[PDB]
Structure formats: C-alpha cells, structure tokens
C-alpha cells in the first residue's frame, strides 16, 4: 500500500527528479509519502540503501538491452549495450551519479558475467573483453555525466554550433563507433604487431 | 601573505584531500585558515566560487600536456593528452567531480581552441575533431570517476581478478588505444563505406 519497497522507490526517483541526488534526503522523502521519520526508517533505514534500491532499479527498470541476444555480433551488443546504459541513466535526473556511487549490486554481477562469457565466446580474451566492456561503460558514463551536468575562440565557434543544436547523441555515438572498432582491429589483429 | 588566492587555494586542495567535496565548506576552510568567516567572504563569496578556481588550479598546476608539441602525431597528442588529464584529475580527491561540476574557463577555451586546430591541422574536420577530443574527455572523465568512487560469477573472479591488481592504468590505456585506433580508421576512410 503506501509504506513498501513499490511505492517507496516510485515516490524515491519522484522526489529524485525533483530535488537531485544531493537534495534528496530521507528527511524530505518521509514527508513526501506522508509519514514520520520513523515510520520511514523501519523500511529505509538511510539514504545510502536508499540510493542503492534506486540504481538496481534505474537499470532493471530501464537499462531493457542489458543481456545479447542469441544470433548477435558483439559489435551490435556493445552498441545496443551502450545506449540502453546512456538512456537508462538519462532517465532520471543526476541518474549517472546514482549509479557511479553504487557498489554493483549481484544482479550484475550475473549480467557481466553473461556479457563477459559472450565476448569469449567470440575469441575475445577475459582481459581484452572485459576492458572492452569497461571503456564502453566507462566512456558511456563520462559522456551522461557531462550531459547531466551541462570573447570566442573561432573554431569553437562552428564546433560549439554543432553540440548547442544536438544533444550530445551523435558525439556519443560517434565516438561509440570510433571505441567498437578499436577492438575489432584488436581482435581480428592475434599476435600481430597491429 | 594568510589571506591571498595563493594560500586560499592551498588550503582549499588540501582541505579537499581531507574531507572530499561534498565535505568542503566556506566555514571548514576558514577554520583551516584561523580567520573568522566574513573575512574569509571577503576574498571567496561562496563554495561555487572556491571550486571554480580549485578546477582551473587542478588543471593548470598538473595537467601540463594540456597543448600539442610542435611535430607530434595527433595519436601522441591524445594519447598524451588523455594520460595527463587523468593524472591531474587523479592527484586530488573528487578532482574528476570538482571538474565535472565546473563550467569551462577560458582558460580551457583557448586550449580547446589550439587542439581544435591542430586536429583540422590533421585532415580532421571540425566535427569529428571535436568528437574526438570529446570521446577522450569523456572516457577519460568516466574512467577516472569509476576508479575516484573505488557467490562469485566464475569468469569475473579471473576478471576481477586483474581490475584487483592493478590501479585501473592499464584499462584506461588499452581502452585509449582503441579509441585513438577508432579515429584513424575514420580518418583514413574520407568518402568510403568503412
């Protein structure tokens, strides 16, 4: 009814939207579902579970390419992998931020390994596959976190024209492909001075 | 002399190492620095204020591969480029965030500019010369947060195990190949279906 997991974590990414991941405390959440502190406390027992509950659910609820489908290139995999994570955490305001305080919870613990068996699979080695899975991940973060957080020279001009009139997707996915070929010429390269 | 930019700023990276950002008050500093806080005010009106300069001072004070040497590849460049923004980034706590948080500088613009330059220099077009330089931030960036905030699946324990052993450098840098390697074949491709 009001005072469970469901609407705790609904009224959680609400509040979330309306006040960021610094101006949400469980001081205001209370208040937001209508109930004393320590109503509240008995099912959330600080901000940091709080916080965690709302990252597992920010991807599970949203991050919907988490896992490849069988008859699929890896290519197409970290692709897809890549903007469902950048949608997913664009979902929610400050989303990035949640999600890089959180320690990662088991559930993903199975998805990187699923990822992982996937890109062996496909003559990728643990190490290469999974700093494969990293700086897609980690390139993927950087670009939403600046997103989420954002005289002239004359060149800055014109390529400042072309981030003011998008919104950062094509950089993004530009520089997706530009990471997804890196490896490709690495895996297809074996022990070759490429 | 006590009160000064110079010292103000001393003391504030410092007090960053020792309580993080979020931890970083106008009154902490004060009492770091001995003065009452309206004489504090007096030289930094408020936190924001304080962490613009301690962006700029971060970057200016360790980022010294912040422009190209005459006579360098751009893969160099970057590759330099990206290593020594890390470096600066990683030298204090939550620097990466105390970036993120800061809108550029003109420090920064001209900077931009210059690289900019250099890449069209190259054969780069505006456009993916600023993609460039901004999937290397951008991964850079994500890189250095994830590693700034840091049952078992089989696999994972061997891939953790080598995210375990070293510091992150070795991810970083073997993603930063592929994503350099991920431009030159962009470059080189001009009017083909690459």
């Known amino acids: 009814s009001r ?34 502190q320590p109503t509240l406390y008995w099912h959330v027992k600080n901000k940091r579970a709080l916080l965690d509950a709302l990252a597992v659910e920010i991807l599970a609820r949203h991050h919907d390419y988490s896992l490849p489908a069988a008859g699929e290139s890896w ?31 088991e559930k993903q613990y199975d998805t990187v390994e699923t990822q992982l068996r996937f890109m062996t699979e496909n003559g990728f080695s643990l190490r290469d596959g999974l700093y494969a899975i990293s700086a897609v991940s980690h390139f993927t973060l950087g670009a939403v976190l600046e997103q ?7 060149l800055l001009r014109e390529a400042l024209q072309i981030m003011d009139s998008d919104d950062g997707e094509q950089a993004f996915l530009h520089g997706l492909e530009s990471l997804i070929r890196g490896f490709e010429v690495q895996l297809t390269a074996l022990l070759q001075i490429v």
């Open 3 to 36: 005072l469970n997991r469901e609407s705790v974590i609904d009224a959680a990414l609400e509040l979330l939207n309306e006040t960021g991941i610094d101006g949400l405390t469980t001081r205001k959440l209370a208040q937001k579902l209508g109930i004393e």
């Open 75 to 105: 290519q197409s995999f970290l692709r897809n992998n890549a903007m469902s994570f950048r949608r997913a955490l664009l979902r929610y305001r400050d989303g990035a931020k949640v999600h890089l305080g959180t320690r990662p919870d």
């Open 148 to 154: 989420q957080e954002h005289n002239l020279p004359p």
